Structures are given as structure tokens and as C-alpha cells.
Design an enzyme around this catalytic site. Structure first.
Site, PDB file in Angstrom:
ATOM      1  N   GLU C  53     -15.740 -31.859  -8.524  1.00 60.52           N
ATOM      2  CA  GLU C  53     -14.558 -32.310  -9.232  1.00 60.52           C
ATOM      3  C   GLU C  53     -13.287 -31.722  -8.639  1.00 60.52           C
ATOM      4  OE1 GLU C  53     -14.964 -31.405 -13.278  1.00 60.52           O
ATOM      5  OE2 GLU C  53     -13.271 -32.663 -13.826  1.00 60.52           O
ATOM      6  N   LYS C 122     -11.324 -39.612 -14.417  1.00 58.70           N
ATOM      7  CA  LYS C 122     -12.209 -38.991 -15.506  1.00 58.70           C
ATOM      8  C   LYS C 122     -11.932 -39.731 -16.798  1.00 58.70           C
ATOM      9  CE  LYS C 122     -13.921 -34.276 -16.850  1.00 58.70           C
ATOM     10  NZ  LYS C 122     -13.624 -32.817 -16.562  1.00 58.70           N
ATOM     11  N   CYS C 177     -17.896 -35.132 -14.397  1.00 60.30           N
ATOM     12  CA  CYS C 177     -18.321 -34.097 -15.276  1.00 60.30           C
ATOM     13  C   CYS C 177     -18.565 -34.485 -16.759  1.00 60.30           C
ATOM     14  CB  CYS C 177     -17.416 -32.865 -15.109  1.00 60.30           C
ATOM     15  SG  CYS C 177     -18.114 -31.326 -15.864  1.00 60.30           S
TER      16      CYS C 177
HETATM   17  C1  ONL Z   1     -17.184 -30.276 -16.682  1.00 57.75           C
HETATM   18  C2  ONL Z   1     -17.653 -30.405 -18.113  1.00 57.75           C
HETATM   19  O1  ONL Z   1     -17.239 -31.305 -18.830  1.00 57.75           O
HETATM   20  C3  ONL Z   1     -18.652 -29.413 -18.667  1.00 57.75           C
HETATM   21  C4  ONL Z   1     -18.473 -29.201 -20.175  1.00 57.75           C
HETATM   22  C5  ONL Z   1     -19.659 -29.730 -20.979  1.00 57.75           C
HETATM   23  N1  ONL Z   1     -19.243 -30.198 -22.330  1.00 57.75           N
HETATM   24  C6  ONL Z   1     -20.745 -28.702 -21.117  1.00 57.75           C
HETATM   25  O2  ONL Z   1     -21.241 -28.174 -20.112  1.00 57.75           O
HETATM   26  O3  ONL Z   1     -21.181 -28.385 -22.242  1.00 57.75           O
END
Ligand code: ONL
Ligand code: DND
Ligand code: DND
Ligand code: ONL
Ligand code: ONL
EC number: 6.3.5.1
Lengths: 651, 339, 657
Positions: C53, C122, C177
Site C-alpha cells: 500500500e 481504496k 488493505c
Molecule cells: C490495512 C488495514 O486495513 C488493516 C486493518 C484491519 N481492520 C485489521 O487488520 O484488523
């Protein structure tokens, strides 16, 4: 519990298509005719009575439809018929020209027990050839909301459904004449939305061929829409200024004619028939693509206004106004049966031909007992080989002993196949002594017959033809595995026993084999037609009800009892001498039915589960676990036996 | 406040049951279901999920299309409904039911004498060993109501069942294959506000299939910040072509709460106390959850909400939950080492 | 005519997940790393390279993301990456904060051969716990139209598809992500829309338990979407003001891990793998409920914009970056195999138990030869009876000698054993039929064999009738597949078949498992051990025919695909893994000629000859996720078909050696 003899309690609904006497321009006279015919429907315990297009005015009156006194009189007559329906059983559907907003519409007024339920405008108004309807009348398509009929706003439009809250298989849609002639009829959409009974009020002046057009479209409508179609045309009384009228009435159900009346009658006529709502329920339950078509037209099928009413139909014995064939697999009509036979035979034969081509023309190995099944199987084998340009001597017929026998050797010789006899008695005995040994002796033999055939098939470049028929598959009347249940290809698998005899006598009558061959086959018939848990007439009857519709046991008992209780009621198929024409009491029907559900649903499936190849034959079904019948091999029939105990009287 | 009440602390006692199936015999299935629901009631549970097509047996193929089968299903249902008048939990019971033209693969939600709704299976596998579209209609896109013994109850795939006296309990039901498709009914239901997802399964057992059930039920629960309640068919289902392991399991936000013996002899129940406040709290903090709802506003705002009152037990009924001493220190050695 | 050794020519696509060196606030430097890792991907013939990212900025730079000079530096570093990709073979997917309308978007720039194909914002911006993305960045959910990059308007929004025009089974979707953590992920709809390869760019600061979370959700996405999932996270170089990074990368296909890289690496890392686009194609082709779900969300799915590019992948031998196992029914990982076996066994047992309950506990008649199959079926039948509380003496086992192991096992188990010599009956039948052997001729043909085979079955069935029992089937899945059995009367026929769904290669391992469990005891163990040690070479090695069975039964792969797979699995005995229980000696290799020869025999026997015996099959449970062969279940086919087209595909596509 249930009144067993009540058609209503068995999911029937009684319907009448009526043709009344018209007095053109005289609605009080039309109404008096209607009321009188309705009183007869009531007396018949009819749920529904359909009258012809513009019943109250006369269809043929043209600009008289635009007269204030015509319209007013129409209205007054209408109100009196609604008042008179307070004491009548059926929904009445009467045609009338009614004012709404700017114009008059060509309407059907759906009337029940002192109220109007709804008012349905004709959707498509023919303005061509002899027809002039757009001159006087407005089109009904797209019209909704309500109409005021005698101090009441009632539904008005082409989106209407009249559902019986106490008879949920009876859902009524009404359309008018031309409405069923157009590429996309309003009744088609109403079927997808839930309508099971489709009514058509017609004027329909008569012309050379027009009764044939009405039939084509009422029939195919009923079939394509998995519905009853109830149709009334106008009759005597209508104007003959330019036209004539035949008064035709008819009732269709899934493509089959239930009732129809005299054309050009002197006086009023009706078709009255019991529509089987479960039959319709059953076809719709099974043909998923019907529902797929509904979901495709979801917006269109979901906007119908459902209008409820309670029928309170009669609960007692009112007979059954329906033909119930004794042999669902054997049509009593000679021309129809001749066609059925031609197709069954050609199906089995072409089923075998393909197999044989695919295997590069093996020998055909077949056990022949002199019985109906193996006889007919031999004919099929023979015709198949003939058609494929194959020597009949490549059919290897075996008598396998451990009377009727003589027929086998005669037929084989008459046909010119290769006949042979293998005595299995000594192998049987060796086997029985090795095993440490009635019933038992018979299993060992039946098994060894199959064993030898299979081995001879291995030896001689052949395939073993199976010979067991549909009724035997249904009942589990076979030796499973090493036994007559097993073969390489079964030609008789989809043919019920009740039809085999008719097939052989079809082959005789065709007579395309020899005159010699005809004699030996006729001998087979005479020797054989004279497996002991049930007459197959009865078990083939139940088979049909179950395989096709999944009908409940009491429903099966009722239909069979209606088809079979009196020897001299209803029709018999050809090849039945008057001393081979039996009755069965309810007690008999009930008994054989208990055996049927127990053997069919519980006992026999494992034998059907490992079934050889063979073609499906009857619209009623076959029993292949790769085709028409998927069921568990490990299930009890408690449910069906319990249904019999509770619902079916002991006598 | 009763300090020792799990309910008063925001817990909901949930049960996934595998009954003894008697194929083609609804009255006997209803007998096994009723027995197990009384056991659940005794346990103070608020929900009991049974296997797919509980009342008929999943595996009966065209016996589904037989009239006497359907009549008996409906008579058994009506009797089950009658018996729950006295039963604390909401029952979720499979049945093949007629509506309009066809039969549907349904789950019937039953509480205290009434049916709350009827939920058709959305996706009907018709491949490999599954033949469901032959006998049964897809439930996807179906709405409106359905006539069950004199009442018109809600019918369709957009139903939520909310405990008016226990707001953290919001129930959605889906059926077997409904959880295996890219866009499950239950993902949208969670956005609409479902906190407890039920799945009734038939699910013939195959090498590996429990791993598959696991992955999707666990990942559903984690992705949707929900409890996920799974119940599969076991002993009694036809073995004409298939085998059944009667697995039941309860997930919560990725954690496994309870699961039962595979291939048991006899009936089995998973029973577990779900922390509705856990779910509530994760939902509160993860804004992107609600962002996702708002992106699918029309989808998620159309759900219909049926209210019922649980009136759960007030008292001390223990706590059917493993609370670790050290939230920061896993007692499991493999996990602790990973940490 | 194809280059048989080309993975591209067998429907594979080489994908790479990359973690680079972050120099935060320094796009020219992040670019330079990216480019160097992209060239290594090119060298490897990879068609895809997914980076972490915000690759070009650094994910963790917070309000430095709002600095004009940061934003400007990024844009210039991108234009340079694009110019370099002119001579690169892989589609590059590269994170970057980009200006569009009023804000900066957390975007993925999909780049290919000197042109941007599309920019993907995103959808979903975590603003909770350690994440503060709504402060600097705008959501992409539901933005569309275009964005101007280096003098070109290029597709911009979250409904993009990159469909390779020379590689129809490679259709790329990109998310970022948190996009894959929400109930209704962007990529779920894009799989319905037609994406086969799902890319995810992550920052994902590392935390206790979070790598399991990444795995749970990337794996189940790949499973539920019938897709590959390509996942890359940031590592070294990101800011450690409040957080740490592990640089995890991974590739999933349909729920299976193709590749993964070392966590917390010193230096840059890649997962490279060959994705089988036909496996995905075949899975989608068969699960129609997948399509039913698309039609339910027709508006969603039909809205997608499809961007084309010619991938032009290399034509030659570039190896197979894939683990193809020798035994698709027999997992090489020993705890996985222990699990399969537990399950196979309990499936067979419970299936038969239900048959027995349903028939009010009949006697159990079984022909015992001392072979693997009948040995195993006896064990299964013993356990069924135990569990149901039935006496073991109600198993009636029969040795049926024609023209020690069985008897020892029978007695060790405590079942009713008996010998019946079929010889005299075979003799009598062969005579009655006029077989040359009955007059001395040593003609040992099919009939000779079948007469015996058939009589064994005939006997068992009559015992079954006489004694109130049912005959147990013994034939296994591999035999059903090949029609290596005697049809109708014989072998192929029984009241219930427990081994029907179990292939031959799996049978021995089931017995091993039975011995290991120890539940039957010392002597039983010993006899079973003995059976394994004491124990058709014209249908070929079952190890090869089971390999072929799985590809056809599960995927319907064309023959040259199966040859490719088998050759890669079986060509070198010293390469790849073997399950437990293959002593070094017991470890064959097969040449292309061998594999090709037996495949010709497989297609002919399987598609053409054998269906008819499968068609009239007794009842029995399905066992393997690979499928079973019941005609009421997994395999519906004609009994009257030629296999011409398969044999012709082999002639044209598979080299003769
Ligand atoms: C990059 C990302 O969104 C990770 C956060 C996600 N909610 C998690 O790992 O719990
Ligand atoms: N659900 C199930 N799954 C698997 N196996 C099941 C089973 N139910 C019984 N069995 C077993 O199968 C066998 C019972 O089947 P089967 O061997 O057929 O024996 P069964 O049906 O008891 O006997 C067939 C009878 O029908 C008559 N028959 C026979 C042959 C030809 C004809 C004709 O059309 O001319 C008439 C004759 O009277 C004969 O004895 C037994 O071994 C029993 O243990
Ligand atoms: N498509 C089709 N539809 C209907 N029938 C078809 C047919 N194709 C052949 N047939 C017929 O079926 C028969 C051929 O089938 P089948 O009777 O099985 O005979 P077949 O398959 O030719 O031979 C069986 C062979 O398998 C091997 N086997 C059997 C049993 C056990 C073992 C062991 O190692 O333990 C090995 C052994 O070599 C044996 O000779 C012929 O009568 C043929 O005409
Ligand atoms: C029913 C009716 O309106 C007369 C028949 C129609 N015009 C036709 O096309 O035949
Ligand atoms: C129904 C379920 O949850 C698991 C089995 C399912 N039918 C499948 O794996 O396809």
C-alpha cells in the site's frame, strides 16, 4: 375423518361454462336466463359459472350499446343478479357493457354471494373484418383502480385474481374473447402470478374453422399455463344481421378436454366438469421452468391484486363429474391407443438400435420363457436387428429349464433366431447342496439363469437383454443383482405390464412379421392372459398417480374407486372380452394400495437404484434413478400407510 | 442488578442442535426437535438452530414432491409451533414448504406459540452430489408473506428478528450454501444490523468438507463482527450415496465458542454464551463497517424487522464461556509461543 | 504443436507479490526499489507484480501525505516507473497517494508496458485504533470516471477490470488493505463480475495475531470467490514512531496457499507462483450457485469497466512454480493424511451403519480374498457392527477358492468364517456352456475368469437370501473408474459398497491408519500389517490412473493438461514430497512416454468403455472432495460414447517421449 366421497374434499373444484338464451337489447330477459342457469349450477354444487361475452346486453347490438336506456337497463339487471347471488353457491362471471370514466368497457362482472368481487375489462378490442368493437368500447389494458357498482367501489382492471380462502387450489383469472388470441395473453401472466382457473367469456360469431381456432387456443393456453381453461361462446338470440352463432362451450385442463357442449343447440347448454386442483398443483410443483418464467416477469406478475372470498363448497357426496380412465397407461380410445403403441414400440427399438450400433453390433442374448415380457422383448430385438441390417441369427434365444415353454421355441423358430436350451437344474442342485439347502430353490434358479446368460454373453460376443417391465420395477418383483433385475440393456423397463399385451397385439395387427409369427404371438396372448400381490390393473393405476403427480393415498383410492367400482361405467380399451372385465370394491382398492405404498416407497428402491440402461417410454414416467425417480433406498413408508388408516374407509 | 446473571451482563445463550433424522417421517423429526428444544429451554438458551430440512430429512430427493410428505411436514410444523408456547428459545427449524408454484427449502423461525417468519434458501446447489433445483425453488429475491396455519407470517430473505428486550440480539437466518457464495445473504444482513447469523445445513460429509465449513463460518463471523451458528445433518439421513457427520459449531468474531462431536452416536448440541457487548463494541469502533453499510444503503435499508420479546431468565445460570485469566497471555502453548 | 513444457500454454499465469524497501517521504527511492523488483519479476516471466500500500510515498508518513512536495515527488516517480515499464513484461500494481478533484486518494496504479491502465482508490479508510486514514485521505467507494496522469485520462474508480486479451482466464481486480475486511468487499462483486485474480495492497502494521487475520480473510476470499488472491504488505523502512511492519507477502488460490514469504525479512522479498487459471475456470463452470449470486446482483456486476491489454507472455519452458503432488487423493503432509483417513473411515462406517439400521440389522455377507480392499471392508464392517451393538458373528465372511491372510483376520476379529470351494460349480458351468477348458484346453480368457468371478457373487447373494443378510461390495473407486471389475453378475454387484468412493491409492493408507489407531488390537494389527506386506499391470499403475481420475473428475482438464501435471509431479522421484509409508525403494519415477501411454488407456477406458458398469451401481457413500463416481451423484455420462476426441488431443498435443 374426511368424507371420502366428497370431490371437494379431494381437491376438486366444480366448474360450469354456460351458454344462455340471448334477447338482444333486453337485459332483464338475459338476466332471467342467467339466474335460471346459475340456479342449476348451484344445484350441481358448482363453484364457478362463466357466461358469454356481454351476456347482459347481447354482444351483437353495435351502436345500441351506446343508448342510455340500454346502459341503464344493463345496470339494473346487474344489481338484481347480485342480489339474487346472495343465495347461490357459485362465483358467477357475467358479461356487461359498463360506464367507467369516459366510456363503456366490455366487462366481466365477477359476482359472489350478494357482492360484486371485481369487474374485468376486455383488454383487446378487434377492429377488423366482422368486428367493430373500438367504435363503441374502450380498451381495458392498463386500467386499474375501482368502479362504482351500486354504492360500492370494487376492483376494476386486468390485474385481478379471485382466490378462494377455503380452497387454495382455486385461483380464478377472467379474460374476454380476443384476450386469448394475442401473442401475450393477459391469462398467461395471470397464470404465472397464481391463477389456476382461467375463464374466457366469448361472443365469437361462428365461421368455417373458427371452432377449431377456439379449441387450438383454449387447449394450448391450458397446457402452456398448467391450468384449467373455461370457455363460453354466445348462442341463439344474437343478431343474425351479418353473423351466426354456435353457442359452443368447453372446459380444458392442462391440454385435456374435460367437457364440451353441443354446437348450434336448440336451447341453453352447459359444460360442467370437476377440475382437479391437485393435478395442477402437481404439474406446477415439478416444472420449475414455469416458476423461472414468473421470476423473469417478476414486476409484471407481482402486481396482481388478489381478491379473497370464501366458497363454503358442499361437503357431501355429489359424485365426480370427470372421466377417470381405468388404465392411465392404456387409453380406451382405439385411435389414441394405436398411436401410443406405435410410439412405445419405436422407442424401445430405437433405444436398442443405438446401443447396438455403439457396441459395434454384438450378439443379442435373451432368456425366453414363453411369457408376455420376453416374447415382446424378442420381437423388439428382432425388429432392431432387421432395421440395422443385422442377421436375426445373431439373436441368441435361450430356454433355461430347472405349457408356456412351447410358445418360446415356436416363436424363435418362426422368427428364425438362434434357439438353444440350457438346463440349469444340475448347477442349481450343486449350488443348493453347497449352500446347505421353496423360495430358496426359486432364487438359486432365477439367479443361475442370469449367471449363464451373462457368461454366454461373455463367451459369444453378446449382450444380455433385460425383459422386466415397469410395473415389476415399481413393486420390487425381481431377483436383485444376480437375477432377472440385471441385464446389459432393458427394453421393457419403461413399459408397464398393462400396456405390454396391447403392444404385442399391435405387432400382430401391424402384421409386418409373418402370418406364422402372428399365430404364435396370438397364442402367447391366449395362453398368458388368463406375480401375486395385486392386480397390475390396480398397481399400474397407483403407479401413475404417484410417479406423475405424487398424489396422496386417499386421493389415489378415490380415483381408482371411481374408475373401477362399477364394471359397466366408463370405457374399456379394445381386446377386453366382456367376461374379463372385473370390478374392485373400495376394500380391494385399499388393500392393494397399502401393499403398493409399502413396496414402492420403502421396499423396492434399492432394486431400481442399480438399474441397467433402457429407454423411458410413457409420459407418465419411467423409474430410472438417472431420470424420473430419485429416492432413498433406505426409507420407511409409515407416512403413507398412516394416511391410509386415517383417510380411507375400511369398506 | 443480579450480578451473576449472564443475560444481565449482555450475554445471549445460543444453541446449535443436530437431531436424529427419520427420513420421510416428519412427526418423528418433530419429536426429536421437541425433545432437544426442551433441553435448551432447561439450559436457559434463547436460540436453537437445527439442520437443513429438519422436518423432512434433507436427503429424500423426489420424496420432497410427494403430497403426503408435505401434508405431514405442515402438520408437524403446526404441532411444533403449538409446543413452543411454553418454550423459552426461539426455534429455527428446516422444512420444505409450499408457496405459490413450488416448494421452498425453508427455515421457520418459531417463538412462544407463533411463527415469526419463514426464510427460503437463496442458492440451491445443483452440481456434483447436489440436485436441489430439481425439487426446489430459489428463495433469492422473494418477499411478501406466507400462509402458515391461519396466519400470514413474513416470508423471504430480507428478515431480521430483534429481541425488543435485548437489543444486542438481532437474528438473521441463511441456509447451507447461502454462506459459500461471494456475496452471502448474511453479509448484507449484518450491515443491516444482524448480530447473530444462523445457518442450517444438510452438508453431506466428504473428506475436507469440515475444514471448508470452518473457514467460511469462522471468516463470516470475523468479517461480519457477528456470532455465527451452524448445525449440520447427521444420523438418519439416507446413505444411498452420502455420509453425514452432524457437526455443529458456534463462532463469534473469529473465535470458536463451542463445537460438538463429529459422527456422534445420538443427538448433539453446541451451547455457548455469546457476548453481544463484544460484538457491539467492535462494531462501534470499526467505522469502515458502517461505511460499507452506507455504500449498500438500499440493499441494507430494505430489511424487514420482526420484533419478539425473549423474557430470558433473570437468575444465575452460570456462564457457558471460556474466559482466559490472561487476555494478553494465551494458555495454549502453541499460540503463546506464536504470540 | 503447442510447446508442451510452457506453463503459459497450459493455462497458468505467473503472479508475484512483492515487499520492497520503504524509504519514507522519498518516492524516487521507493520507485528505484520497485523498479529493481519489477525487473526480477520480468526475468521470472511473471505477469503480475503487486506491491505494498502507498508504495511510492510510504504508508506511515501521516500528514507528510499532505505536503505539496511529497505529492509532487510521487507523481514524478510514477511517470518514471511508467516509462520504464515500456520494456517490462508484468502488469505492475503500485500504491501512491494521488490528487483527484478535491482530495488525495489512497490509490493503486495498475501499470503495463508504458501506459497506466487504471487507478484504483481504496474503497474503505480505517479511522480507528492505530489508523487515521480519513484525516489525510478520501474514500474511493463509488467514484468513477477518469484521472489525468502524465497527459492521459485513464480509468479511475473501484469497478475496474483488467482483462488480458491473449489470456482470457486472467482478469485482474485490485483492492487495498481494509477493502477485504468489511462484510461486502469490493473484490467479492468483482469476482461475480468476472475477476479471476484478486490483488490486495497492504500497509498493515504488524501486531500479535494480525498475520492470522490477514490469512483468514485472504484465504476465505480466494475460496468463496473461486479466485487467486495476491497479497503484499509493507516491511522495513516504514516509520516505527508507533508501529512495526513484517513485510508479509502471500498468494492464495481457491483456499490453498501457493506461496508466502519470510516474516520480518532483512531485505526485499517476493512470493512468485503459477496460478492455474483452468482450475478456477473449472470450479466456476461447475458451481452454478456462483452465477446465481451474480444474477442476483446483476446491477452491481454488469456495471464493471473492463480494460484490455495484450500480456504477450513468454512461449518457452520457464518451469512450474507450483507444487503438484503425486497423489491427489493422498496428501503428502502427514497430519493432513491422518485427517483424511479419520474422515474416509468414519464416512464408510456411518454409511453402512445407516444401511444396517434401515434393514433392521441384517447379517453381513462378505467375500474375503486376503487382498487390500476386502481386508479393509471387513474392518469397516466390524466397526459398523460394534457401534450398532451387533455381534461380530453376524458378519458372515467367505473365502471362495477358485482355480492365510483372510482366515487369520477373520478369526482374529471373531467373525463367522467359512470356505466355499467354487471349483466344482465353475467346472459344471464351463461344461454346460461348452467352454474349451471343460475338455482340457488351457484357455484362460475373460469367460474363464468371469465364470469364477460371477459364481463368487452368485454364491454370496444366495447366502444373503438364505441367511437374511446383505452382500458387501468391495470394489474401490479406481476400479469403478477403469471398469476393472466383472459386470452384473460378479464383482461390480452388491447390496451396499463401502469402498466405492475410496480410490486404490488411498486404501493402503486407511489400513495403516487402522493399525495406528490400535483399536482392534495386537493380533488384528499384526494380521493387517501382514496384509500390507504381502500386498492389473495392463491398466497401468494405479498411482497414475488416480492422478488422471482426480483431474477429470474434479476439473475436467484436457489430456495434455493432465500429462503436464503428472509429468511435473512424477518425473523425478527425488523431487517433491511423498506421503508416509513409501520406503526409498518403493519410489518410482515415470517418463513422459509412460505417462502418455497410460493416459491414452485412461481416456479410452474411462470416457468410453466403463460407464455402463458405473451406470448400474449399488449404493455406497461418497468419500473424497475429489468426487465419487455414482451415476445418481457426481458422474452423469453416456454408456455409449467414443473417446475419440481425447485420444486425438493426445496425438496432437502430447509429445511421444
Ligand atoms: C490495512 C488495514 O486495513 C488493516 C486493518 C484491519 N481492520 C485489521 O487488520 O484488523
Ligand atoms: N434396502 C436394501 N438395500 C440393500 N439390500 C436390501 C435392501 N432390502 C433388502 N435387501 C436385500 O436384497 C435381497 C432381497 O432382494 P431379492 O434378492 O430380489 O429377493 P426378494 O425381493 O425377497 O424376492 C423376489 C421375489 O419376487 C419374485 N420374482 C423373482 C424374480 C423374478 C420374478 C419375475 O418377475 O418373474 C419374480 C419371486 O417370488 C422372488 O422370490 C436380500 O439379499 C436382502 O437382504
Ligand atoms: N456399453 C455397454 N452396454 C451394455 N453392455 C456392455 C457394454 N459394453 C460391454 N458390454 C457387455 O458387458 C460384458 C463385458 O463386461 P464384463 O462382464 O465386466 O467383462 P470385461 O469387462 O470384458 O472383463 C472383466 C475383466 O476385468 C478384470 N477383473 C475383473 C474382476 C476382478 C479383477 C481383480 O483383479 O480382482 C479383475 C479381469 O481381467 C476381467 O476379465 C460383455 O458381455 C459385453 O458385451
Ligand atoms: C373472441 C373474438 O373476439 C373473436 C375471435 C378473434 N377476433 C379472432 O381473431 O379469431
Ligand atoms: C452446507 C455447508 O455448510 C457445508 C457443505 C456445503 N454443501 C459445501 O461444502 O458445498
Amino acid at each position: 375423518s374426511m368424507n371420502f366421497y366428497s370431490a371437494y374434499q379431494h381437491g376438486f373444484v366444480r366448474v360450469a361454462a354456460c351458454t344462455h338464451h340471448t334477447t338482444i337489447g333486453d337485459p332483464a330477459a338475459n338476466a332471467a336466463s342467467v339466474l335460471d342457469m346459475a340456479r342449476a349450477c348451484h344445484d350441481d354444487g358448482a363453484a364457478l359459472a362463466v357466461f358469454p361475452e356481454l351476456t347482459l346486453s347481447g354482444y351483437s347490438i353495435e351502436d345500441v350499446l351506446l343508448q342510455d336506456s340500454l346502459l341503464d337497463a344493463v345496470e339494473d339487471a346487474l344489481l338484481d343478479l347480485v342480489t339474487e347471488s346472495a343465495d347461490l353457491l357459485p362465483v358467477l362471471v357475467v358479461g356487461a357493457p359498463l360506464r367507467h370514466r369516459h366510456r363503456i368497457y366490455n366487462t366481466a362482472v365477477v359476482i359472489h354471494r350478494g357482492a360484486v368481487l371485481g369487474v374485468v375489462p376486455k383488454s383487446y378490442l378487434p377492429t377488423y373484418r366482422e368486428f367493430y368493437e373500438r367504435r363503441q368500447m374502450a380498451p381495458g389494458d392498463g386500467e386499474r383502480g375501482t368502479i362504482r357498482i351500486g354504492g360500492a367501489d370494487v376492483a376494476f382492471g386486468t390485474d385481478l385474481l379471485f382466490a378462494a380462502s377455503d380452497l387454495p387450489g382455486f385461483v380464478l383469472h377472467v379474460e374476454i374473447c380476443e384476450d386469448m388470441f394475442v401473442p401475450m395473453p393477459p391469462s398467461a401472466e395471470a397464470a404465472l402470478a397464481g391463477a389456476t382457473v382461467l375463464a374466457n367469456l366469448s361472443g365469437s360469431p361462428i365461421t368455417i374453422g373458427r371452432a377449431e381456432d377456439r379449441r387450438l387456443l383454449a387447449r394450448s393456453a391450458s397446457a402452456r399455463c398448467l391450468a384449467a381453461y373455461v370457455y363460453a361462446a354466445a348462442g341463439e338470440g344474437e343478431s343474425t344481421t351479418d353473423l351466426a352463432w354456435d353457442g359452443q362451450t368447453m372446459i380444458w385442463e392442462n391440454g385435456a378436454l374435460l367437457a364440451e357442449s353441443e354446437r348450434f343447440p336448440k336451447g341453453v347448454r352447459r359444460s360442467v366438469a370437476d377440475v382437479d386442483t391437485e393435478l395442477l398443483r402437481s404439474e406446477r410443483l415439478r416444472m420449475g421452468t414455469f416458476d423461472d418464467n414468473r421470476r423473469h416477469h417478476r414486476e409484471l406478475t407481482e402486481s396482481f391484486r388478489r381478491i379473497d372470498f370464501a366458497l363454503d363448497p358442499p361437503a357431501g357426496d355429489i359424485g365426480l363429474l370427470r372421466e377417470v380412465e381405468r388404465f392411465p397407461f392404456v387409453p380406451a380410445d382405439p385411435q389414441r391407443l394405436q398411436q401410443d403403441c406405435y410410439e412405445a414400440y419405436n422407442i424401445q427399438v430405437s433405444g436398442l438400435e443405438q446401443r447396438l450400433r455403439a457396441l459395434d453390433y454384438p450378439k443379442v442374448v435373451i432368456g425366453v420363457s414363453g411369457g408376455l415380457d420376453s416374447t415382446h422383448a424378442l420381437i423388439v430385438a428382432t425388429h432392431a436387428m432387421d432395421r440395422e441390417g443385422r442377421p436375426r441369427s445373431d439373436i441368441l434365444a435361450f430356454a433355461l429349464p430347472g405349457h408356456t415353454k412351447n410358445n418360446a421355441i415356436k416363436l424363435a423358430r418362426a422368427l428364425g433366431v438362434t434357439f438353444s436350451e440350457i438346463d440349469i437344474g444340475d448347477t442349481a442342485r450343486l449350488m443348493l447342496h453347497t449352500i446347505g439347502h421353496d423360495v430358496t430353490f426359486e432364487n438359486v434358479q432365477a439367479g443361475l439363469r442370469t449367471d449363464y446368460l451373462f457368461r454366454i454373453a461373455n463367451q459369444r460376443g453378446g449382450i444380455v437383454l433385460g425383459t422386466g417391465d415397469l410395473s415389476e420395477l415399481a413393486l420390487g418383483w425381481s431377483t436383485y443383482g444376480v437375477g432377472d433385475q440385471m441385464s446389459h440393456y432393458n427394453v421393457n423397463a419403461g413399459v408397464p405390464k398393462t400396456l405390454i399385451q396391447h403392444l404385442i397385439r399391435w405387432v400382430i395387427s401391424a402384421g409386418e412379421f409373418g402370418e406364422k409369427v402372428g399365430e404364435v404371438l396370438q397364442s402367447v396372448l391366449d395362453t398368458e392372459i388368463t406375480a401375486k400381490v395385486g392386480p397390475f390393473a390396480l398397481q399400474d393405476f397407483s403407479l401413475f398417480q404417484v410417479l406423475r403427480y405424487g398424489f396422496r393415498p386417499s386421493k389415489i383410492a378415490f380415483l381408482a374407486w371411481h374408475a373401477w367400482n362399477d364394471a359397466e361405467r366408463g370405457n374399456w380399451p379394445p381386446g377386453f372380452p366382456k367376461s374379463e372385465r372385473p370390478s374392485y370394491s373400495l376394500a380391494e382398492i385399499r388393500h392393494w394400495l397399502q401393499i403398493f405404498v409399502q413396496r414402492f416407497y420403502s421396499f423396492s428402491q434399492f432394486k431400481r437404484s442399480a438399474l441397467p440402461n433402457g429407454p423411458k417410454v410413457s409420459h407418465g414416467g419411467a423409474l430410472s434413478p438417472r431420470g424420473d425417480w430419485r429416492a432413498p433406498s433406505d426409507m420407511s413408508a409409515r407416512i403413507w400407510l398412516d394416511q391410509i388408516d386415517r383417510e380411507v374407509p375400511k369398506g
